[PDB]
Amino acid sequence: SKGEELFTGVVPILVELDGDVNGHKFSVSGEGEGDATYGKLTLKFICTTGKLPVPWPTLVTTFVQCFSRYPDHMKRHDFFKSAMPEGYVQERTIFFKDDGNYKTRAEVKFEGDTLVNRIELKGIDFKEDGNILGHKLEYNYNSNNVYIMADKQKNGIKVNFKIRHNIEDGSVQLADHYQQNTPIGDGPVLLPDNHYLSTQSALSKDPNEKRDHMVLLEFVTAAGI
């Protein structure tokens, strides 16, 4: 795509989220960079309102799939880069098993040479001592498969997958993801065949940072064709 050329080098990334989960209001600012040639992302997120009222791992998927590595033979399937620089709207519902849900609306686009993800998140129906509001989730993340298909009535795509967060007692908290993306601009986009993204992520902390924060290293490759 014309959009693919914007991703051949290292690109700065900014993430800005405003959230309300069961009336707990919070904001997060993130900064880092992406190198789509290697499917690679590095970011640091800071809660700017104080303590985050939900576990950091539950927000990873909300916090830029244009940085996925599409193999050359799959490049005609990369919706996300093709929508750039004008960007796309990304909407999700995330259902936490036996607990509440997040609904997110994000716009992903370039602001000058920086790729920006702006998100509004609304969470409702959470248990005040469940695994999310009770902070019972381990600070870690796994490898996942993210399933993608075309949605031509919206010139876009539909995406679904499952995330299993680890609970401190050794059990798992399932988070079912349903996702739709639609282009903002008037340029043509790439509508894909069915395929998936293979992900892996690692969470860490900055030993000198005293604010509530998350450091994220992620690698993602398109596959299944």
Q: What is the CATH number of the domain that holds 14?
A: 2.40.155.10
Long-range contacts of residues 106-113, Cβ cutoff 8 Å, at least 24 apart? 106/62, 107/184, 108/64, 108/66, 108/80, 109/84, 109/85, 109/184, 110/6, 110/84, 110/85, 111/14, 113/11, 113/12
Amino acid identity of residue 90, one-letter, is Q
**Residue 158, C-beta contacts closer than 8 angstroms, at least 6 positions apart:** 148, 149, 150, 151, 179, 180
Method used to solve the structure: X-ray
The 3-state DSSP class for residue 170 equals coil
151/166 Cα distance (integer angstroms): 32
- Output the six-digit token pair for 58: 């539950």
Amino acid identity of residue 70, one-letter, is Y
89/106 Cα distance (integer angstroms): 6
Burial class (CB in 10 A: 0-12, 13-18, 19+), 162: middle
**Owning domain of residue 164:** 1-225
What are the DSSP E strand ranges found in 48-87?
none
Number of domains in the chain: 1
10/115 Cα distance (integer angstroms): 11
> Residue 104 carries which DSSP code?
E
99/79 Cα distance (integer angstroms): 32
> In angstroms, what is the resolution?
1.2
